[PDB]
Amino acid sequence: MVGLIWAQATSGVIGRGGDIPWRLPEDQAHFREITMGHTIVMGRRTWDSLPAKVRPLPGRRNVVLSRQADFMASGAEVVGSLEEALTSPETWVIGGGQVYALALPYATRCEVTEVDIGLPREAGDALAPVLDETWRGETGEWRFSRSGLRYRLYSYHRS
Amino acid sequence: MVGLIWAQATSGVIGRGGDIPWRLPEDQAHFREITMGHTIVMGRRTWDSLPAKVRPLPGRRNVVLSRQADFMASGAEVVGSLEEALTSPETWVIGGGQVYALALPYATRCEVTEVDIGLPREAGDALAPVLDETWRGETGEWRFSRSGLRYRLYSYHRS
Numbered sequence: 001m002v003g004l005i006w007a008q009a010t011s012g013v014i015g016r017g018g019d020i021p022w023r024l025p026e027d028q029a030h031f032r033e034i035t036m037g038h039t040i041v042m043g044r045r046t047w048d049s050l051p052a053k054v055r056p057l058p059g060r061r062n063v064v065l066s067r068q069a070d071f072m073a074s075g076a077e078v079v080g081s082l083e084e085a086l087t088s089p090e091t092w093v094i095g096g097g098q099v100y101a102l103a104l105p106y107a108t109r110c111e112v113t114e115v116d117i118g119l120p121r122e123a124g125d126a127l128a129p130v131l132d133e134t135w136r137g138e139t140g141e142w143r144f145s146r147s148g149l150r151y152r153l154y155s156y157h158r159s
Numbered sequence: 160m161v162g163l164i165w166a167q168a169t170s171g172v173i174g175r176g177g178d179i180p181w182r183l184p185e186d187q188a189h190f191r192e193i194t195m196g197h198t199i200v201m202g203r204r205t206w207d208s209l210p211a212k213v214r215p216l217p218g219r220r221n222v223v224l225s226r227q228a229d230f231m232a233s234g235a236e237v238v239g240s241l242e243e244a245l246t247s248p249e250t251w252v253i254g255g256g257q258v259y260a261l262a263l264p265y266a267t268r269c270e271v272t273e274v275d276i277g278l279p280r281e282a283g284d285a286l287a288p289v290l291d292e293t294w295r296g297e298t299g300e301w302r303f304s305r306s307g308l309r310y311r312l313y314s315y316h317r318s
């Protein structure tokens with residue numbers, strides 16, 4: 001099983017300047033729970049976005065996508081194509097914008113956190129993929145974070 | 160991944176007299192979306208609750224738990240232990256109360272339809288399993304069924 005997990009503002013922005021322009025702790029917990037134990041796949045830039053003291057993510061099979069055949073990620077597997085990374089019974093593609101688009105045709109589930117911030121899209125922003133109607137998606141309600149930001153969860157599936 | 164999917168009253172009742180004191184088409188669609196294509200594991204009583212006109216459920220691997228080594232379920236596999244059914248990548252335990260409690264230690268997901276029906280428990284009822292605190296759950300909106308009862312969906316998850 002290949003799943004996609006991401007947090008987005010309403011506008012679809014997921015990343016900017018190698019960072020995530022917000023802090024929503026509830027989403028981090030949600031992310032940790034859904035990924036823990038399983039294989040996680042990320043783009044090389046997203047691997048670069050993590051301080052060395054926080055990578056690899058504990059308890060998961062860290063895999064990095066890069067087209068550099070020689071690229072080292074200390075503590076993760078480096079593959080040159082998704083299917084080399086997808087190897088895994090349950091695999092979760094954890095970002096970023098480039099990888100999500102590459103993987104979506106192989107995914108059956110998308111776990112979406114939507115953050116109620118008016119964050120407009122700027123050139124070079126990383127974006128969430130847009131999910132059509134073939135994704136049956138079950139809408140949560142607008143929860144209130146201890147960070148101060150309104151948020152809600154979506155669970156998408158297509159058979 | 161071992162999943163549990165069930166519909167319950169607010170009281171925890173899931174079956175009574177070998178069947179279900181409600182019918183929500185919205186919940187049937189929800190069920191088919193989550194189970195379609197995968198292995199479904201059901202107790203023999205639940206298999207008996209399906210007309211032969213409706214079983215096996217199309218497009219899924221139908222598995223029945225029974226202690227009768229000769230029990231015959233036309234269109235399904237009959238297994239005498241639960242671990243036998245777990246060979247497929249995604250397995251959904253679809254009832255009833257006995258099999259739910261047998262499967263809970265293998266489960267990381269629970270897809271719950273909660274029906275707003277004042278249905279007090281009585282002896283003989285089948286019951287939804289009890290979820291300890293290791294289960295975190297995303298509560299849904301009270302939706303409106305065309306049957307006239309409100310409902311809402313839960314997804315419980317644990318690593």
Ligand SMILES: NC(=O)C1=CN([C@@H]2O[C@H](COP(=O)(O)OP(=O)(O)OC[C@H]3O[C@@H](n4cnc5c(N)ncnc54)[C@H](OP(=O)(O)O)[C@@H]3O)[C@@H](O)[C@H]2O)C=CC1
Nearest residue numbers: 007015016018019043044045046066067095096097098099
């Ligand atoms: N909000 C969220 O939920 C998340 C947000 N983010 C944010 O996303 C942003 C980065 O995302 P993005 O900018 O899209 O960069 P990515 O994280 O998408 O990684 C892009 C890299 O992936 C590799 N790659 C892409 N396609 C392929 C392929 N077909 N085969 C092999 N390797 C490939 C390349 O590595 P190389 O250059 O080595 O070839 C490319 O540089 C950051 O700001 C980060 O914080 C990240 C994760 C989650």
Ligand SMILES: NC(=O)C1=CN([C@@H]2O[C@H](COP(=O)(O)OP(=O)(O)OC[C@H]3O[C@@H](n4cnc5c(N)ncnc54)[C@H](OP(=O)(O)O)[C@@H]3O)[C@@H](O)[C@H]2O)C=CC1
Nearest residue numbers: 165166174177178202203204205225226254255256257258
């Ligand atoms: N609302 C919902 O979402 C659902 C409700 N239901 C309802 O639940 C009720 C049935 O649930 P329940 O009454 O608990 O009966 P079950 O559906 O749990 O089937 C029980 C049967 O499973 C087999 N079984 C149980 N434990 C084992 C074991 N350890 N090893 C091997 N075989 C085993 C036995 O088959 P044998 O006797 O042949 O050994 C037993 O009779 C019905 O009312 C049904 O409609 C059903 C599904 C979903």
Ligand SMILES: COC(=O)c1ccc(-c2nc(N)nc(N)c2C#CC2CC2)cc1
Nearest residue numbers: 005006007020027028031046094095113
């Ligand atoms: C301090 O902020 C955090 O620690 C934090 C922020 C966001 C997420 C998150 N959340 C959802 N829903 N999907 C995702 N793919 C990610 C991610 C990620 C990556 C690290 C590579 C997790 C943790």
Ligand SMILES: COC(=O)c1ccc(-c2nc(N)nc(N)c2C#CC2CC2)cc1
Nearest residue numbers: 164165166186187190205209253254272
């Ligand atoms: C005409 O439709 C129906 O009779 C009907 C549709 C759906 C369910 C249902 N619903 C949720 N949420 N979980 C479940 N495990 C099940 C189940 C079951 C099975 C007996 C096979 C029940 C009955």
Ligand SMILES: [Co+2]
Nearest residue numbers: 108159193195
């Ligand atoms: Co599915």
Ligand SMILES: [Co+2]
Nearest residue numbers: 034267317318
């Ligand atoms: Co999991």
